[PDB]
Structures are given as structure tokens and as C-alpha cells.
């Protein structure tokens, strides 16, 4: 990996509100699309925050 | 509820309305805010997350902000369909869990 792919990869490995299909999808995207690693990371962060928000909704009911 | 929202706002169609929530250092002061919408007689749904992002399929007439220990939700071009109870949600680092407001009822005339 280049530096961008490697930093996006490490963060994406750790995200607790991704499932393994999503995580593996973002990691394949980093491999396929190295010049957009920061974009891939942004998409993964948004999804992680949305699925974390869905947990707050479950807690609320 | 750990978070403080004003219980009710009255409004008319086509106006803007802004509702707010007050928190403290270890909840809103440290964590991004979510908004939950409960339409009359419907289950609650996610409206907004990460302070200012729209949940999938939510109208771009909703916008949100977080500053210091406060957060706000603004509804533009108010519609009869917007009459609902709006609840704030965030993580609390002192309680180590989800905290919520008691809801703001928005009535539309």
C-alpha cells in the first residue's frame, strides 16, 4: 500500500459500526483506486457514523 | 432525560423553525448529535446524524448544527407532514452510553 491506502486501511480495519461485507468492500476500493483513498475513507467514516446513529435509535425505543 | 429540549413549538406552513437542545461537556460538548423524528402514531426514525448529515431519504428541508454544549435542528418550508416530536441523541462519556432529550413537539397550523 502507499501511505494514503495504508492510513485509510488501518482506520477502516478498526471501525466498530461497519459489518465485514462493508469493511471488505472499502478495502477492495482502496486497492483498486489508490488516488481516492481519502474519498474511500470518508465514505467508510460516514457509514460508520450512520450505523452508530442507528444504534442510538434502537436504544431510544 | 439527560439532555434539555424545550417541550413545544407552534408554527404555520412555509415558515422556518429552529429547535435546540442544551447538553454539557461530556455529551454534546464531546460528541456529535443525532435527531430522531416521531410522526404522530408512527415509530421513531433517524432524521439527522453527525450534527449535520441527513439520514437516507430525509428531505433537504432539514439542517442541523452543533456548537459548544448546544445543538439545533432547522426545518425550512414547513409542511403539515413535519408536525412531529423531534428528539436529540448523543453519546455521553460520563455515563458511557446513549443519552436523549425529552423531545420537542412541533405543531403545524
From TrEMBL, chain A:
Residues 1-48 form the Protein A Ig-binding domain. It is found in: Secreted, Cell wall. Interacts with host TNFRSF1A; this interaction leads to the stimulation of both surface expression and shedding of TNFRSF1A. Belongs to the immunoglobulin-binding protein SpA family. Plays a role in the inhibition of the host innate and adaptive immune responses. Possesses five immunoglobulin-binding domains that capture both the fragment crystallizable region (Fc region) and the Fab region (part of Ig that identifies antigen) of immunoglobulins. In turn, Staphylococcus aureus is protected from phagocytic killing via inhibition of Ig Fc region. In addition, the host elicited B-cell response is prevented due to a decrease of antibody-secreting cell proliferation that enter the bone marrow, thereby decreasing long-term antibody production. This is Immunoglobulin G-binding protein A. It comes from Staphylococcus aureus. The chain holds residues 64 to 111 of 233 of the full protein.
